[PDB]
């Protein structure tokens, strides 16, 4: 029968909640109550990158912290040199409904995906000097929402069919399939060791997976609505999630519970992108109200505002050396801030 | 600059920024439309009728899980694009906000099916009152008018039970009925049309509008209807920019 299984699930959930409560001796606020605030963080638009016709849906920083790829729904991937705002590449896409993009750690490849349910891997270092589709990965039965290279041969893609997958670009097959989410998977973030990754979905939950094994180690709840963004802490022991309830939350894996809640009464718009600073002290979050907010990740106090985008901020990211913050928005411009 | 490399970069960018300027000229000259409707609405037949306008190159197989379908048709050299969502899940609250800069949403409903007419009204209401589609206007097609006329004429339908307002309803005076048409058919047609119009008029301010049409099964002028509605939308927006409207 189903009633017995429902009761078993309820009992297991109650036991997990009781264990989490027993492990919650002191809040993060109390521990970090006697720390010096970072003050008002002030940034200026160092660079503005233009050239996209429609809204920019995603972007990713290169490992060299200089080049970045941006995807726009006019059907274009543009690889920029943020130092000089010189366009390095402009790849036209087969399908113009692109919702994600990625940059290989070696810089030899880029990836894109979207409403076509297909993850296209583009080789940037061909012997003929042009950029051609190196591979097309198909098998997802829903729109692709995020993709992150593990290396030049492996890639993790989350789709709207409530599943994520680990692929093999050389063969094009699905090496592993991660299931368990009950809603569209909207974001994923890879650990610095690239052994686990966190996926935040539209069922108001995040899950920590195992790339090598293939099962969900831990499930984190606490959000009220869909989770649009997720980002690992620099040391890999925590992660922040931005959601549609206009709040961000910082969870930690070891405690397996939510540590911090970054919210404001003035803010009633959901979070589209979330990223951390190089030291993890600053949490940057993009909002539908056309602004970005820089929070104190340890005190849960707003520290700065990045304004200057005329439409919804859709992507956000921090260089590998932490030297700049890139924000793209639906007004078709990217901004590099310092 | 320092020449050589810094002259190989700013030139390369100026070779991209030119091609982009060639691409923009074709992106701004085409109109993108989003096709919506239920499985019984008849989007497939409509998109088949308007197809005729207009390593393997002509890949006429797609993929078993495609996700999106493209239909390019040209009316008086305007080159409309129509996008119909394919292999997607039942939940549309996330991928439908990517159609926020689109010339028109073509919503087709099976007007002959009163069993799930409230479902059509419900998702029309959801599309209309959306934060990202609140400036996108809807071209409404009330498909399968011949089936509705046959259902009304043959009797044994009792539309009043699905909508308990057909009793206190009178054909709008502005009715423009075909010379051969029973008054009951006209009453039912305009009742469904006004059911959608009461959703459109309520809220919406004046940034987007609704263009309802009656297209039964053999209307070959649906492409011209879309052309006229898109022309009206574009020039209304242009007037709104100049504060003349």
């Amino acid at each position, epitope marked *: 029968e189903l009633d017995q299984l429902r009761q078993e699930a309820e009992q297991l959930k109650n036991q997990i909640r009781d264990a989490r409560k027993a492990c919650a001796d002191a809040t993060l606020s109390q521990i970090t109550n006697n720390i010096d605030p970072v003050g008002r963080i002030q940034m200026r638009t160092r660079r503005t990158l233009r050239g996209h016709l429609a809204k920019i849906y995603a972007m990713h920083w290169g490992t060299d912290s200089r080049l970045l790829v941006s995807a726009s729904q006019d059907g274009k991937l543009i690889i920029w040199d943020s130092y000089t705002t010189n366009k390095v590449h402009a790849i036209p896409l087969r399908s113009s409904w692109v919702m994600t993009c990625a940059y290989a750690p070696s810089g030899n490849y880029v990836a894109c995906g979207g409403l076509d349910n297909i993850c296209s891997i583009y080789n940037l270092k061909t012997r003929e000097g042009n950029v051609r589709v190196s591979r097309e990965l198909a098998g997802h039965t829903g729109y692709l929402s995020c993709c992150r290279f593990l290396d030049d041969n492996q890639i993790v893609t989350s789709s709207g069919d409530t599943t994520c997958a680990l692929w093999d670009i050389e063969t094009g097959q699905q090496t592993t399939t991660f299931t368990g989410h*009950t809603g569209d998977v909207m974001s994923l973030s890879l650990a610095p060791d690239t052994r686990l990754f966190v996926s935040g979905a539209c*069922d108001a939950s995040a899950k920590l997976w195992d790339v090598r094994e293939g099962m969900c180690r831990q499930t984190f709840t606490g959000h009220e609505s869909d989770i649009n963004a997720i980002c690992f802490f620099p040391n890999g022991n925590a992660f922040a999630t931005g959601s549609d309830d*206009a709040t961000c939350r910082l969870f930690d894996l070891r405690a397996d519970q939510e540590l911090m809640t970054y919210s404001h009464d003035n803010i009633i718009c959901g979070i589209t992108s979330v990223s951390f600073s190089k030291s993890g002290r600053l949490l940057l979050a993009g909002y539908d109200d056309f602004n970005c907010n820089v929070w104190d990740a340890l005190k849960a106090d707003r520290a700065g505002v990045l304004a200057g985008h005329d439409n919804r901020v859709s992507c956000l990211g921090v260089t590998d050396d932490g030297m700049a913050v890139a924000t793209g928005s639906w007004d078709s411009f990217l901004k590099i801030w310092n | 600059t320092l020449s050589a490399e810094d002259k190989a970069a700013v030139e390369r960018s100026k070779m991209i920024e030119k091609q982009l300027q060639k691409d923009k000229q074709v992106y701004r000259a085409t109109h993108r439309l989003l096709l919506l409707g239920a499985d019984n609405s008849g989007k497939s037949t409509i998109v088949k009728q308007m197809r005729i306008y207009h390593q393997q190159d002509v890949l006429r197989t797609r993929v078993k899980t495609s996700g999106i379908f493209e239909t390019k048709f040209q009316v008086d050299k305007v080159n409309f694009h129509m996008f119909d969502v394919g292999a997607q*899940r039942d939940e549309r609250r996330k991928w439908i906000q990517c159609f926020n800069d689109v010339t028109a949403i073509i919503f087709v409903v099976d007007s002959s099916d009163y069993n799930r007419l409230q*479902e059509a009204l419900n998702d029309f209401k*959801s599309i209309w009152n959306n934060r990202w589609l609140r400036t996108i206007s809807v071209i409404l097609f009330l498909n399968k008018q011949d089936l509705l006329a046959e259902k009304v004429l043959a009797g044994k339908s009792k539309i009043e039970d699905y909508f308990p307002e057909f009793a206190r309803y009178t054909t709008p005076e502005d009715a423009t009925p075909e010379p051969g048409e029973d008054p009951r058919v006209t009453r039912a047609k305009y009742f469904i049309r006004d059911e959608f119009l009461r959703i459109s008029t309520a809220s919406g301010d004046g940034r987007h509008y609704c263009y309802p049409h009656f297209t039964c099964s053999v209307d070959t002028e649906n492409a011209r209807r879309i052309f006229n509605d898109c022309r009206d939308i574009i020039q209304r927006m242009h007037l709104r920019q100049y504060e003349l409207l």
Partner: nanobody
Amino acid sequence: QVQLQESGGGLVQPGGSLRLSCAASGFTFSNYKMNWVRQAPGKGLEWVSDISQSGASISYTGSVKGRFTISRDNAKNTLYLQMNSLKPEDTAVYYCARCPAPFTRDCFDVTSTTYAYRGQGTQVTV
């Protein structure tokens, strides 16, 4: 953790009155627009009624207009549906659904097959 529990379903003779109560937890009740959605046996899910954040805006489907009354208690975090003059065609599984996002008018995917913020349903047989 968003949770919705429905109660008040049971066997009722035709023409009777049944009150369904929905207790919600894990989210701020006052900030969301709530819905009642029924699924008849052998059919799909059908939207029944909806109530706004403040309880001012109320709407019902055609088949239940004049018979069903939907209300919300924000202080008690509860959603009530009173059903009067039950018909045999009203036998269904009733779910207490929630709009996906707060402070919004569009209730997308509430009638979907695998909606997340929906209750597990209560059976009402006439």
